[PDB]
Ligand binder design. Structure first.
Ligand SMILES: [Zn+2]
Ligand SMILES: [Zn+2]
Lengths: 119, 117
């Protein structure tokens, strides 16, 4: 058995993909529209889904935002240098909650934990 | 770069660990109390954290339950036989909601089972 992915609902799919690709160097693994269900999915990550865990992003066409709650914690990502990742995210105008570990917020306010490689 | 883990806050850490270890065959990778912060965390998964993504579970000592929103979706797990894992989860008393299936953990977090493939 293996963990395949976490799924997060996003108010704006392209806004979410722009963050994961620019701030986090992720690649779009697959993307599909479901008019029958009025939703779109995008899988993003680093390796192909057959090799590693990915992040699934869902946008429901009939929604403009979601209730977050305080149950969901964060997504942790291993990075080469947390300070460079942080500085780049701030340069792109993204919220850096705390700044070797650091925390980013995606456009929907989901927290991303940056864990510098070799910790 | 790689995804290390998702983190979820649980009302009862023992109840969460019984689900993840017995219904989903996960190994308890590590567990640590932090008296200074009045919380405990546990890491669960299949491979060691250096090789694959894990799941982090947190319990805050001063909390009895968490506000669950509709933003967080689910955690998907690859299984050898979805109908077998499903039936075992049911045999342990866990709910199986509406080859892919959906389980609910003790806090109501959804687990998507995807048969390998
Ligand atoms: Zn974490
Ligand atoms: Zn999924």
């Amino acid at each position: 058995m293996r963990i395949l992915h976490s799924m997060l609902r996003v108010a704006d799919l392209e806004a979410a993909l722009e963050f994961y690709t620019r701030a986090l160097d992720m690649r779009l693994l697959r993307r599909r529209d479901y008019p029958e269900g009025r939703f779109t999915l995008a899988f993003v990550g680093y390796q192909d889904e057959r090799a590693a865990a990915a992040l699934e992003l869902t946008h429901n066409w009939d929604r403009d935002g979601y209730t977050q709650g305080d149950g969901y914690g964060h997504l942790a990502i291993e990075v080469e240098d947390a300070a460079v990742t942080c500085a780049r995210a701030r340069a792109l105008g993204y919220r850096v909650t705390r700044e070797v570990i650091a925390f980013l917020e995606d456009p929907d306010g989901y927290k991303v934990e940056l864990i510098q490689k070799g910790t």
